[PDB]
Amino acid sequence: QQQQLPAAMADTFLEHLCLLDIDSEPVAARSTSIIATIGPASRSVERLKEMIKAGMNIARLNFSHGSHEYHAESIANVREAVESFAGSPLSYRPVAIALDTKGPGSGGLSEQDVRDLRFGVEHGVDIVFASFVRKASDVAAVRAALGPEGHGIKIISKIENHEGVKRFDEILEVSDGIMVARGDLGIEIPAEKVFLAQKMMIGRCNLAGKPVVCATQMLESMITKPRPTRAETSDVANAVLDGADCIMLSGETAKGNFPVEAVKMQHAIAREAEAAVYHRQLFEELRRAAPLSRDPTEVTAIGAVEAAFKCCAAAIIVLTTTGRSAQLLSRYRPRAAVIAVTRSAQAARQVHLCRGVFPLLYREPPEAIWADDVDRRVQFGIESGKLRGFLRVGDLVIVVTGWRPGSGYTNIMRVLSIS
Amino acid sequence: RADVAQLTQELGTAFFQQQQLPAAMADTFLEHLCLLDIDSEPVAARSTSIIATIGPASRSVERLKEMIKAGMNIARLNFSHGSHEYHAESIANVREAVESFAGSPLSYRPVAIALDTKGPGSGPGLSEQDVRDLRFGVEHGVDIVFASFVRKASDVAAVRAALGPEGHGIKIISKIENHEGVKRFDEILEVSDGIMVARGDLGIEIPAEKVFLAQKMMIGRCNLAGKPVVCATQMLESMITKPRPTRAETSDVANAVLDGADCIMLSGETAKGNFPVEAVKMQHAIAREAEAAVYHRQLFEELRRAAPLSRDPTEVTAIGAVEAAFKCCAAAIIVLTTTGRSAQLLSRYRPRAAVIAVTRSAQAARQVHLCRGVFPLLYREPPEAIWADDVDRRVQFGIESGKLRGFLRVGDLVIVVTGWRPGSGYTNIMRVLSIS
Amino acid sequence: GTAFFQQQQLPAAMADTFLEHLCLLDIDSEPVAARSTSIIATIGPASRSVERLKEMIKAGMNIARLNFSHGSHEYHAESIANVREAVESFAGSPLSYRPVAIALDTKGPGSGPGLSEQDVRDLRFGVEHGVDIVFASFVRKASDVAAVRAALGPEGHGIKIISKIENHEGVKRFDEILEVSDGIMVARGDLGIEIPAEKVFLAQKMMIGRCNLAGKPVVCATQMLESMITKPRPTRAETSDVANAVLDGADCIMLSGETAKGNFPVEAVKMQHAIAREAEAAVYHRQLFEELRRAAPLSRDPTEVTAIGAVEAAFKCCAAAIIVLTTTGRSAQLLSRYRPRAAVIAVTRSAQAARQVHLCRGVFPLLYREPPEAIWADDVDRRVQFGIESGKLRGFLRVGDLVIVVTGWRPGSGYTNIMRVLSIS
Amino acid sequence: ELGTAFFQQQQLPAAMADTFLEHLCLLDIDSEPVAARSTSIIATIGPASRSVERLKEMIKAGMNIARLNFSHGSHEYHAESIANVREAVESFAGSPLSYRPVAIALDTKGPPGLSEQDVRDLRFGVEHGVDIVFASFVRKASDVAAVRAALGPEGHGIKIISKIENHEGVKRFDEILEVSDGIMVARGDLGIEIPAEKVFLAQKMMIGRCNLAGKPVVCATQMLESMITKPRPTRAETSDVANAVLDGADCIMLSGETAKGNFPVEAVKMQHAIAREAEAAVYHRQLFEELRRAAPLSRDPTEVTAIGAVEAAFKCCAAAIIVLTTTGRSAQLLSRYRPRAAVIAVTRSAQAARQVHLCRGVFPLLYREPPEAIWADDVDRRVQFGIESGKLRGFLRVGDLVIVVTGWRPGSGYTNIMRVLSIS
Ligand SMILES: O=C(O)C[C@H](NC(=O)[C@@H]1CCCN(S(=O)(=O)c2cc3c(c(O)c2O)C(=O)c2ccccc2C3=O)C1)C(=O)O
Ligand SMILES: O=C(O)C[C@H](NC(=O)[C@@H]1CCCN(S(=O)(=O)c2cc3c(c(O)c2O)C(=O)c2ccccc2C3=O)C1)C(=O)O
Ligand SMILES: O=P(O)(O)OC[C@H]1O[C@](O)(COP(=O)(O)O)[C@@H](O)[C@@H]1O
Ligand SMILES: O=P(O)(O)OC[C@H]1O[C@](O)(COP(=O)(O)O)[C@@H](O)[C@@H]1O
Ligand SMILES: O=P(O)(O)OC[C@H]1O[C@](O)(COP(=O)(O)O)[C@@H](O)[C@@H]1O
Numbered sequence A: 001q002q003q004q005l006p007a008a009m010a011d012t013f014l015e016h017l018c019l020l021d022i023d024s025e026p027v028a029a030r031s032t033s034i035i036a037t038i039g040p041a042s043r044s045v046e047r048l049k050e051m052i053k054a055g056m057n058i059a060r061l062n063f064s065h066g067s068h069e070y071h072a073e074s075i076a077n078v079r080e081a082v083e084s085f086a087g088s089p090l091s092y093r094p095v096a097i098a099l100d101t102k103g104p105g106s107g108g109l110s111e112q113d114v115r116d117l118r119f120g121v122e123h124g125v126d127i128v129f130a131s132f133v134r135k136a137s138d139v140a141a142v143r144a145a146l147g148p149e150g151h152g153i154k155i156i157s158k159i160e161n162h163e164g165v166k167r168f169d170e171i172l173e174v175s176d177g178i179m180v181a182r183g184d185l186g187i188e189i190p191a192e193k194v195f196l197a198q199k200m201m202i203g204r205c206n207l208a209g210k211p212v213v214c215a216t217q218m219l220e221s222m223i224t225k226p227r228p229t230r231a232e233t234s235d236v237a238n239a240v241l242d243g244a245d246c247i248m249l250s251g252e253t254a255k256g257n258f259p260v261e262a263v264k265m266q267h268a269i270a271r272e273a274e275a276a277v278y279h280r281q282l283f284e285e286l287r288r289a290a291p292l293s294r295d296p297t298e299v300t301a302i303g304a305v306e307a308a309f310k311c312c313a314a315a316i317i318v319l320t321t322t323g324r325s326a327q328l329l330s331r332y333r334p335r336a337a338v339i340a341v342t343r344s345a346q347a348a349r350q351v352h353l354c355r356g357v358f359p360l361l362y363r364e365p366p367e368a369i370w371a372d373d374v375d376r377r378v379q380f381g382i383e384s385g386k387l388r389g390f391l392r393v394g395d396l397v398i399v400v401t402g403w404r405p406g407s408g409y410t411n412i413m414r415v416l417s418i419s
Numbered sequence B: 001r002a003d004v005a006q007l008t009q010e011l012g013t014a015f016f017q018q019q020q021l022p023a024a025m026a027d028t029f030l031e032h033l034c035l036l037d038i039d040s041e042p043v044a045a046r047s048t049s050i051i052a053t054i055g056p057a058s059r060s061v062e063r064l065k066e067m068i069k070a071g072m073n074i075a076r077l078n079f080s081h082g083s084h085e086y087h088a089e090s091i092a093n094v095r096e097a098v099e100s101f102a103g104s105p106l107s108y109r110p111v112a113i114a115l116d117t118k119g120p121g122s123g124p125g126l127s128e129q130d131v132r133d134l135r136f137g138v139e140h141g142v143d144i145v146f147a148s149f150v151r152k153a154s155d156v157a158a159v160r161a162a163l164g165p166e167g168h169g170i171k172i173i174s175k176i177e178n179h180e181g182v183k184r185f186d187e188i189l190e191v192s193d194g195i196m197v198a199r200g201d202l203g204i205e206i207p208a209e210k211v212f213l214a215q216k217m218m219i220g221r222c223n224l225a226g227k228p229v230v231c232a233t234q235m236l237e238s239m240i241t242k243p244r245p246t247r248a249e250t251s252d253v254a255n256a257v258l259d260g261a262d263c264i265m266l267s268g269e270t271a272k273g274n275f276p277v278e279a280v281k282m283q284h285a286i287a288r289e290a291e292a293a294v295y296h297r298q299l300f301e302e303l304r305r306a307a308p309l310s311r312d313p314t315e316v317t318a319i320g321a322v323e324a325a326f327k328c329c330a331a332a333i334i335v336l337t338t339t340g341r342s343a344q345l346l347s348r349y350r351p352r353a354a355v356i357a358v359t360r361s362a363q364a365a366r367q368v369h370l371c372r373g374v375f376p377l378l379y380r381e382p383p384e385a386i387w388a389d390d391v392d393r394r395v396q397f398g399i400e401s402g403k404l405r406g407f408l409r410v411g412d413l414v415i416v417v418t419g420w421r422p423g424s425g426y427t428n429i430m431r432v433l434s435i436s
Numbered sequence C: 001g002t003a004f005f006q007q008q009q010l011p012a013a014m015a016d017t018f019l020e021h022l023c024l025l026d027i028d029s030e031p032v033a034a035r036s037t038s039i040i041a042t043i044g045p046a047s048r049s050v051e052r053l054k055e056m057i058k059a060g061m062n063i064a065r066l067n068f069s070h071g072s073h074e075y076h077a078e079s080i081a082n083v084r085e086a087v088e089s090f091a092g093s094p095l096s097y098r099p100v101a102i103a104l105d106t107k108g109p110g111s112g113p114g115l116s117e118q119d120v121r122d123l124r125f126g127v128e129h130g131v132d133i134v135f136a137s138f139v140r141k142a143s144d145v146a147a148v149r150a151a152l153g154p155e156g157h158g159i160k161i162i163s164k165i166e167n168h169e170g171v172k173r174f175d176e177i178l179e180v181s182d183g184i185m186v187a188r189g190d191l192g193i194e195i196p197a198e199k200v201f202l203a204q205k206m207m208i209g210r211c212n213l214a215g216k217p218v219v220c221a222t223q224m225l226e227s228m229i230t231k232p233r234p235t236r237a238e239t240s241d242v243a244n245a246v247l248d249g250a251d252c253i254m255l256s257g258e259t260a261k262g263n264f265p266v267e268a269v270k271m272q273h274a275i276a277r278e279a280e281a282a283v284y285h286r287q288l289f290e291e292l293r294r295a296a297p298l299s300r301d302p303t304e305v306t307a308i309g310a311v312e313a314a315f316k317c318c319a320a321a322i323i324v325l326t327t328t329g330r331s332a333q334l335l336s337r338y339r340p341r342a343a344v345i346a347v348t349r350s351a352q353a354a355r356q357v358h359l360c361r362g363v364f365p366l367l368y369r370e371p372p373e374a375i376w377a378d379d380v381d382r383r384v385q386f387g388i389e390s391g392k393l394r395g396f397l398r399v400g401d402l403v404i405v406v407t408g409w410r411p412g413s414g415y416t417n418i419m420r421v422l423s424i425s
Numbered sequence D: 001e002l003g004t005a006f007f008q009q010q011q012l013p014a015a016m017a018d019t020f021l022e023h024l025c026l027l028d029i030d031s032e033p034v035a036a037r038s039t040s041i042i043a044t045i046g047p048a049s050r051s052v053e054r055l056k057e058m059i060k061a062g063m064n065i066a067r068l069n070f071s072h073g074s075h076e077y078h079a080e081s082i083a084n085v086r087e088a089v090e091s092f093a094g095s096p097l098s099y100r101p102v103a104i105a106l107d108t109k110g111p112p113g114l115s116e117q118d119v120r121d122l123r124f125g126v127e128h129g130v131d132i133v134f135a136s137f138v139r140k141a142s143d144v145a146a147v148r149a150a151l152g153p154e155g156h157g158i159k160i161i162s163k164i165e166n167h168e169g170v171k172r173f174d175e176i177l178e179v180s181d182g183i184m185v186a187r188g189d190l191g192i193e194i195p196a197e198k199v200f201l202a203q204k205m206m207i208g209r210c211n212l213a214g215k216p217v218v219c220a221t222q223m224l225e226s227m228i229t230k231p232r233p234t235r236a237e238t239s240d241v242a243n244a245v246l247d248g249a250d251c252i253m254l255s256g257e258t259a260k261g262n263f264p265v266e267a268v269k270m271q272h273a274i275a276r277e278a279e280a281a282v283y284h285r286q287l288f289e290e291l292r293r294a295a296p297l298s299r300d301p302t303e304v305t306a307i308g309a310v311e312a313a314f315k316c317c318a319a320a321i322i323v324l325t326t327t328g329r330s331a332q333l334l335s336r337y338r339p340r341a342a343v344i345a346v347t348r349s350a351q352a353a354r355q356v357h358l359c360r361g362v363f364p365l366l367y368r369e370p371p372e373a374i375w376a377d378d379v380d381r382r383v384q385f386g387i388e389s390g391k392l393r394g395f396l397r398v399g400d401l402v403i404v405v406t407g408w409r410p411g412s413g414y415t416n417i418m419r420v421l422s423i424s
């Protein structure tokens, strides 16, 4: 069987490793998002279209380099390349725009960061990767600089030094997610300890149900060479096996000679690594560690993920306004793809931060009766699923909806047979 | 502590001290035993059904009303004794006592009627007396048949044939009473609705010191198959003459419930003993204590690992509903069911939450007592013009009855299990509702 | 051979879950191992004759309980003499001799706060007559155990004190009582009157689990085979109660009226023996050993470190037995706490230790009577050979079996530190 | 007692966790490694690492096995490299605290059958007393039988580590492992023969199967590749070394990093530093439980004693397991259970001392004293030699507990005793 299913049925982690097979082909869609840094090698609209097709989900703008005019042109080219595929709504792929700050240098929040954060809000960025976060008040300062119009922007705190690692719990508590920024971390702490910080932060983010990004030098040699080293493919695979929600490309896409090939390589590795995850242990541990809850979205999410594993569901289709119901399903790491149907273009972009969430932006005319409108969004999730290869006739899907309009009311799970 | 800290702040430390919840959160079975507490009071309604044999000591309508109030769920008629006229009178008295509570539909308790056959004796097949007794059962509308000395699958096919076309709905519980029945258990279970571990004859047919092995094996296999299993005979034997049982008898009842039995039975204790009502009360009190002492964490994990993957939406919905109920400490799972099957599939996962089964079928309401933790509510209202409105009314009946009976309080979370179209076999929906 | 793997519930033993272990239990899978749960029989008019006592020792009685709630000191001194005469009648065959402990069960405190004056006199009688164990009635707190220990005086330091938990206070103060006691008795008779009868199983399971965690003996007592006081065969609930006490983890099971005053004393001992043997094979060792290991704290005591290594080695090779040399019984007790499937054959020169180790599940005491060899290593080896020859005569061992041998580096108690894998020749 | 400081080091809070997820959450960059580095480092000897002075620095940095790649150079060139390795190793014989055996491994050029060049290179290996052969492109069991036959009448004690470098070797892995002494995951060729994105699956599978079989497994190629020209490795390279150790590799290897790069000693130091951190991060609670469950029951006393000794070592946090071995087999059977305690192997065989570097956590001590007339006295002198070397090296202190593994009679194959000793 395909997708490492013989290894998935093993009774121990050791026997699971023994049953991994190079001939067992991945079938599921790639779950881990790829963040590509936009720079001179990846700015053109033509190049960006190839990167979107290769698998890029989030475009990162590094505000340590370039100018506001330079980054505004990069953003416009990304949006032009993304919108060139809007003519086919059943296959359109949203792409998030993330702003990576310069940081505080030797100083609180720098004056350049205040200006760059204002630029981000004015240009409608979806995410901020806040550099050198060392305490909870650093996150509050970034949040205040985003102003009242930036309330919806996700703040991903970059842990880059000893203090950020030691104050991790307080930083995670007030952040939307974390970035393990291994470049600076490997200079701030002994290089041989970075893997411990990475594994600990990934484990704690998985426990909290918050996104974690593994970043820097994942495919470094691909800046000048067409193929990566054996250590680089292993590093990407191990970040996915560790539990990372996203993987990142920096120089490989910003300035390298093979930007599209680097995206394709991360895509190919992530797909193979996701099938090699030992879900039997992972799901059991995530389920046991997740606290008891009286929030109906939290209760519906665990019931839906348990139902999906019971029937080998091809997908969990969820309606979401903010992305929260999809995120609560994602935290249990289902093998079934989480297809998130939303009308919010921003939520569709932001939900790429959560592993295994495939956003579908709903642009069909509204139905007069709310129950009919919900049913047509579910049929849209199914038709997009069929066109993209997620679903076939005869598959079982789990459908997650709410009892009334508006965010916060998810409380229903349904088992549906396709066609 | 982090996995229960926010819910402990919300529900309070008193909530988490009751119903053996500190033992329930233990990481190993050994730690679970160490945390069992005689001061941790049971809160949940008693989920293991009590089968009481009706005889001279428990035949009067007034006595039967006391037995229904004490906890009797199934009335057993032993066709090894008495006559058809005698058993017909016992059935009529049971129905009169049961119907005396029908005036309040929100609190009415259905009681099943089970016929226990005499058996084949030295003969190889279905005896002539069994054919007549089975015909009597169909004519008197019995809900269940406890078939004596089942030794192979063809014995149950013979009982099924003798029930005729009008007895298709009657549940057949095969009694395993000898070495052959134990050895051919898998084939017998496959064609039966459930099993009875008939320890009286089993303890004479096989060495007495081996009966506990047969009991534990059959209970484990029935739990794995999701089929009811009854533990029977000499559970509270000394209560035939004494008002209080021995230490071995209370332990035996508690251990049958901990083994996984769906029902426990009283024979001479209710049929001829001096303390029939007290015997029912004692089984009720022990079963409530033992149900709270079940280590659900291991049981649910093992039922998931052992159960094969399923593409039946009723089965997929049932595991999702039970998982959701454990996540929020749901007070109940309300399920709409025509035949009892959706309630049975929830029951096989052994939820701690009560399974309140709302049905229009009076027979299904009586028969679901065979499944652990299923509380039947008989809905008597005529159908609404719009099917979705009729579904909603039945769910509200379950909620309002749940509040009236003490199962539910304002602020509780309940899991609601329904289907997408009318008729049996279409359960596919799970909803989380907050009680207001 | 394939026959080996069909016996002693070995298909159920290899199951991956407790549920599948239950599903694989087989009434045709015969027990092979020797019965490991000790039987305590209460002495009375039905079991006091020397000839009847010989039959009870052959049926499996390991501990004789003297109930000091009945009879004078003169009655109990005769009971002691008769027990010793019956036990010593088998001393002429040292390879088959079975030690039998004598336990004194006190009358209790009554309406008083703690140690009654009658208990002080009974305890002094126990020391003067050399009893091995005291079952202290109605223990409610740690100071009750200290009072029993003080009443035993300086000459009774070696006597084991088993605290009987018989009321709500003893259950609530269980941890402090267990800490100062050598073991516990779940006295279900009084417990079932002091607390609601439907809660006794919770107290029994909790106390057995905590004693197993602590590595201290626990006795399940009262009305286990009650109907056998007058009837030749027990009820279905009684056989199930005995089997479930063994499956719960009890080290000993007890008979009271069944052996003291009933008409079937020998048959009651035989019935407990037959049930315990079937129940011990049905224990799911895979989960039990895993949980005992995880719960047991780290240790720097070499006896404890050797014991866990020896039990792990025994499971790896399906050892027929673990033979241990012991002066006080402590090395055998530390092996027993890990619940090996292999029998723990304890070879000792101490007649008292040989009697007292019956409190520990799976310990088979052998009393070595030969004078010491001049070379200490030769004395150790002769004792190990005595364990092997006793084991072969009694059916524990055959040629070709593997056995784990546990010894120490110097004479005297407290120095066990060696484990060795030995092939039986 | 041990103190609270003891329980804060070597990731002991993460070691006590009840789940793998909790274990990851408790990993701490401030919890310092204390145990000696247990994963062996294989360094390829070439132009950048051939001189006696350079080899002395590589031995001090942590090199345990010297690899000679017969795909390059000549017999004369490799004979000079072997002589320089032996000269550098023997320069530390004057101090027990610095002397360390170093194995010599011959890596063949590769292949219808065994090539003429491989036959001659294998003969060169036997004549020069190599300890190990890394056999290139092993595709089936008969390839290993051909290498074994070419090792001739004198080289039957040489360990054959089969290099799995293509699709066929991966598919016929079980039959190859059965007849080999160990495996090398040769990722360079493997990443060209199969899709590059599948190499991690083959690596994890082969490591898991070798751990299950109790046979050494080497992770090789491009582990610290950028260190050929740069003084510090990339983030992906440090992670790759740490993950090979966490996967269960017995050895890690350096190729161009030591053979031709500008920083050979620094590459060895980097592998040493990462392996030490990664070994403390292994979740022993699950690993030991799974190795125990997957391993079949055994009636071999060495195997039964090994599991009892490893269980005893975990129970008391033993500083070391001292084992007397002539062939290395008793040390290998302890190593397969992955104890946290160091396995100090006392042997009179210089070849067994070099070869046990293939087994994770085995620290060989070569013993050269003349045999005592009373065998029990000869055994006691070797046990005390292991203890005094352990005290001198920092493994042991007075008051520590050690597990000692011996047999009941002389000769290899009789290990059946485990003892708990308090260090005095
Ligand atoms: O302290 C510093 O000076 C910088 C520091 N380190 C680095 O950025 C690394 C070293 C430099 C190269 N990069 S890179 O290749 O990933 C990279 C390069 C570029 C851009 C990036 O975003 C980017 O990540 C631009 O955006 C851009 C824009 C306009 C012109 C050129 C460029 C460009 O070359 C890695 C940091 O980010 O804090
Ligand atoms: O498929 C092949 O072509 C054969 C294959 N080679 C490679 O692919 C490797 C990758 C490129 C570089 N390395 S290297 O830097 O590690 C390497 C280089 C050299 C030596 C090595 O051992 C060695 O591994 C010498 O021993 C030596 C001796 C004398 C002169 C020069 C040298 C020398 O340069 C070799 C193999 O050896 O398996
Ligand atoms: O994931 P979120 O943000 O809570 O959104 C979930 C919400 O989406 C719905 O399914 C559909 O709501 P809308 O019709 O307003 O889009 C609600 O019933 C539910 O509360
Ligand atoms: O448990 P059963 O027998 O399958 O009945 C479940 C059925 O009950 C319902 O919830 C309601 O059906 P009715 O309206 O026919 O009573 C169905 O949607 C579902 O299929
Ligand atoms: O179990 P205990 O009382 O600690 O006795 C174990 C002792 O028995 C021995 O094996 C034999 O000692 P003796 O020769 O004194 O009987 C000692 O080596 C060991 O210390």
Ligand SMILES: O=P(O)(O)OC[C@H]1O[C@](O)(COP(=O)(O)O)[C@@H](O)[C@@H]1O
Pocket: D324, D325, D326, D327, D328, D329, D330, D331, D378, D405, D406, D407, D408, D409, D410, D411, D412, D413, D414, D415
């Ligand atoms: O690991 P190996 O090669 O089997 O060697 C273990 C052998 O070493 C010993 O401990 C000591 O043997 P020698 O005195 O011959 O060295 C033997 O008793 C045991 O059989």
Ligand SMILES: O=C([O-])C(=O)[O-]
Pocket: A131, A158, A160, A180, A181, A182, A183, A184, A185, A215, A216
């Ligand atoms: O800023 C970053 O991404 C880093 O340092 O790794």
Ligand SMILES: O=C([O-])C(=O)[O-]
Pocket: B148, B175, B177, B197, B198, B199, B200, B201, B202, B232, B233
């Ligand atoms: O028939 C019965 O119920 C029995 O034998 O137990």
Ligand SMILES: O=C([O-])C(=O)[O-]
Pocket: C137, C164, C166, C186, C187, C188, C189, C190, C191, C221, C222
């Ligand atoms: O004293 C006892 O043995 C009792 O009360 O059970």
Ligand SMILES: O=C([O-])C(=O)[O-]
Pocket: D136, D163, D165, D185, D186, D187, D188, D189, D190, D220, D221
């Ligand atoms: O030969 C090797 O070492 C390789 O291919 O990795």
Ligand SMILES: [K+]
Pocket: A062, A063, A064, A100, A101, A102, A103, A131
């Ligand atoms: K930046």
Ligand SMILES: [K+]
Pocket: B078, B079, B080, B116, B117, B118, B119, B148
């Ligand atoms: K009958």
Ligand SMILES: [K+]
Pocket: C067, C068, C069, C105, C106, C107, C108, C137
């Ligand atoms: K008494």
Ligand SMILES: [K+]
Pocket: D069, D070, D071, D107, D108, D109, D110, D136
């Ligand atoms: K080579």
Ligand SMILES: [Mg+2]
Pocket: A131, A160, A181, A183, A184
């Ligand atoms: Mg940085």
Ligand SMILES: [Mg+2]
Pocket: B148, B149, B177, B198, B200, B201
């Ligand atoms: Mg019968």
Ligand SMILES: [Mg+2]
Pocket: C137, C166, C187, C189, C190
């Ligand atoms: Mg009493």
Ligand SMILES: [Mg+2]
Pocket: D136, D165, D186, D188, D189
């Ligand atoms: Mg190669």
